[PDB]
């Protein structure tokens, strides 16, 4: 099992600039590396990485994904003097050279390999690599926007040259499209390419047609490459997360890529001067957390654009926060995306359903408390209960004098205790984060859990249950959400609940990415609370889950299955999650059907352009 996250960045790369007069080319800055890496830095980030030292990319390696022409070319710039290096860089569209700048550009493609190889070779989990210049623009036989060499397409073929890889997902989250990337994968089916980039009707730069959502892939790649354009500035978080919920992830998690890279381009944050969107960096932590169960975790963030030198650190220093495995910010104010992005969404669905089925349309961290008289061995990060306290039995024989009363067991007025003290180290500490409690009554245990927690304070209570029957919780006030996956059919009554009744994995993955994370984060919980009375899918699930409530999630286990409780155990600790590896059209329906039963009330769900009256 591999542990810690790579930080590959060299001094170096920040020594090389432009030269002359050019305002296209003005913001590429050395500058940006510093004020990233002191940014980690200062919030104590660098030092948690293991720093993998920077190398020359070879030769060969470079002809992995450009010409003999185009290399020769370039590697003649170090004798170039200015006049020289502007009638060279004037060849091609928004770039300019340096005498320093091949060197660089090996320097940032053997970063890039470095990190693939720490990554592949199971020295780290996954890892971040700080390099300049940027690739995803760059092309076989042409630099094109500040960008010499592809970086991340290097690192896609080199993985599948040296480790067999069959399939590999690359996620380009940079306001600009990856040109390179799509060039060089369009017809290959085994590198998923995945962009969102500002479009604006084909009036942004680089201006092509084929950036468009109907660049679906050619030949045996169709369906392999997937567009977003946005068409109007100003995109938010819940555009973002929308784009990911209902195009993204489920296309990824169907796809099951063995390594994940993304060319981390943060000019897509809020402030940038060439993106101009409104997406707060901490949406970067989620962006990246949502990832994670993707190939073991095993994530290879590539640095690309990122032009706000006051923000760039910001967005960098989330992305890092999140690979660490640091718990994600509470994002609030969610909501509906806006009709340009569910046109584009709803385009680009439409468009890529012929190729994934789930697009078509009709027309110490953990705290583990387990049952008395047992020991396991649980991970590193993760303690029992320290016994109770004496205002903690004060509190539990007053809710039973007070409440149910009659009861004289006394494994379940500990198992009672001890959820509360978890609450209790939860929320009223920066201690511990998660915990999970197996109990014994679970009418008495979910009282006491939900009402303990809400007294914490908790503002909102999100509720995951996993069983029959009614348990008793209140879905009348606006502060507690339940999402019930039952057997029977039940009904869809009421908007402050999600009811779901083999493929059935496929089924449940798709209900947890298209209703029930979009409800989730608009809901913005402080403390989920996971119910499972007496499957296989409940490691991504609570994997998933840890983004809401800033990662405080209290389960409560009606079953002494040492499988199941290893496993919330080691999802809880934040261990990798194994992969999965073709829905019931039943289930579908009643997906869709609980989408237009809740989406008026909810906006994350919609994947379509709303219909006046
Ligand atoms: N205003 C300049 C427009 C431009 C041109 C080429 C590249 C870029 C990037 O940000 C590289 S990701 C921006
Ligand atoms: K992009
Ligand atoms: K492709
Ligand atoms: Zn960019």
């Given amino acids: 099992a591999a542990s810690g996250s790579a930080l590959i960045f060299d001094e170096e790369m920040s020594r090389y600039k432009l030269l002359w007069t050019d305002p296209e080319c003005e913001i590429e800055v050395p500058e940006r590396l510093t004020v990233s890496y002191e940014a980690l830095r200062t919030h104590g980030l660098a030092q948690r990485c293991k720093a993998v030292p920077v190398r020359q990319a070879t030769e060969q390696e470079i002809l992995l994904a450009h010409s003999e022409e185009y290399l020769e070319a370039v590697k003649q710039t170090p004798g170039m003097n200015v006049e020289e290096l502007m009638a060279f860089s004037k060849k091609y569209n928004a770039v300019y050279f340096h005498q320093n700048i091949y060197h660089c550009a090996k320097l940032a493609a053997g970063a890039t390999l470095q990190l693939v190889d720490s990554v592949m070779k199971r020295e780290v989990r996954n890892g971040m690599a700080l390099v300049r210049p940027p690739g995803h623009h760059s092309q076989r036989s042409a630099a094109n926007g500040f960008c010499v060499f592809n970086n991340v397409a290097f690192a896609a073929l080199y993985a599948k040259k040296n480790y067999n890889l069959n399939r590999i997902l690359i996620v380009d989250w940079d306001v600009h499209h990856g040109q390179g990337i799509q060039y060089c994968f369009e017809e290959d089916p085994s590198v998923l390419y995945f962009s969102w980039h500002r479009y604006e009707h084909q009036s942004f730069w680089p201006n092509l047609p084929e950036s468009d959502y109907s660049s679906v892939g050619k030949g045996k790649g169709s369906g392999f490459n997937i567009n977003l354009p946005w068409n109007k500035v100003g995109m938010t978080n819940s555009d973002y997360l929308a784009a990911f919920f209902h195009v993204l992830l489920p296309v990824a998690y169907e796809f099951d890529p063995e390594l994940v890279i993304v060319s981390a381009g943060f000019d897509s944050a809020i402030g940038d001067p060439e993106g101009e969107m409104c997406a707060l960096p901490e949406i970067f932590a989620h962006l990246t957390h949502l990832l994670m169960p993707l190939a073991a975790g095993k994530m290879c963030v590539v640095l690309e654009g990122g032009y706000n030198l006051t923000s760039l650190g910001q967005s960098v220093c989330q992305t890092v926060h999140s690979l660490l495995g640091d718990p994600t910010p509470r994002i609030s104010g969610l909501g509906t995306a806006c009709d340009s992005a569910l046109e584009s969404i709803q385009n680009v669905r439409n468009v890529q359903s012929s190729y994934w089925s789930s697009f078509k349309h009709l027309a110490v961290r953990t705290v583990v408390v387990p049952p008395p008289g047992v020991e396991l061995t649980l991970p590193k990060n993760c303690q029992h209960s320290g016994d109770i306290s004496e205002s903690t039995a004060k509190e539990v024989q007053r809710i039973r004098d007070k409440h149910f009363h009659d009861l004289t067991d006394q494994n379940i007025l500990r198992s009672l205790g001890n959820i509360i003290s978890v609450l209790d180290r939860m929320m009223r500490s920066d201690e511990v984060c998660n915990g999970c409690v197996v109990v014994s009554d679970l009418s008495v245990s979910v009282q006491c859990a939900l009402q303990h927690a809400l007294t914490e304070p908790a503002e909102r209570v999100?509720?995951?249950?996993?069983?029959?029957?009614?348990?008793?919780?209140?879905?009348?006030?606006?502060?507690?959400?339940?999402?019930?996956?039952?057997?029977?059919?039940?009904?869809?009554?009421?908007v402050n609940r999600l009811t779901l009744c083999e493929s059935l994995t496929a089924g449940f993955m798709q209900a947890l990415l298209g209703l029930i994370l979009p409800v989730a984060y608009e809901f913005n919980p402080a403390l989920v609370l996971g119910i499972v009375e007496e499957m296989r899918v409940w490691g991504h699930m609570t994997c998933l889950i840890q983004g809401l409530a800033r990662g405080r999630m209290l389960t409560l286990l009606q079953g002494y299955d040492k499988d199941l409780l290893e496993l919330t155990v080691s999802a809880l600790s934040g261990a990798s999650i194994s992969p999965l590896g073709a829905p019931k059209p039943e289930d579908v329906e009643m997906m869709e059907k609980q989408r237009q039963r809740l989406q008026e009330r909810w906006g994350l769900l919609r994947c379509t352009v709303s219909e006046s009256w």
């Fill in 462 to 494: 999100l509720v995951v249950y996993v069983g029959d029957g009614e348990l008793p919780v209140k879905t009348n006030d606006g502060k507690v959400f339940l999402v019930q996956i039952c057997t029977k059919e039940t009904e869809d009554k009421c």
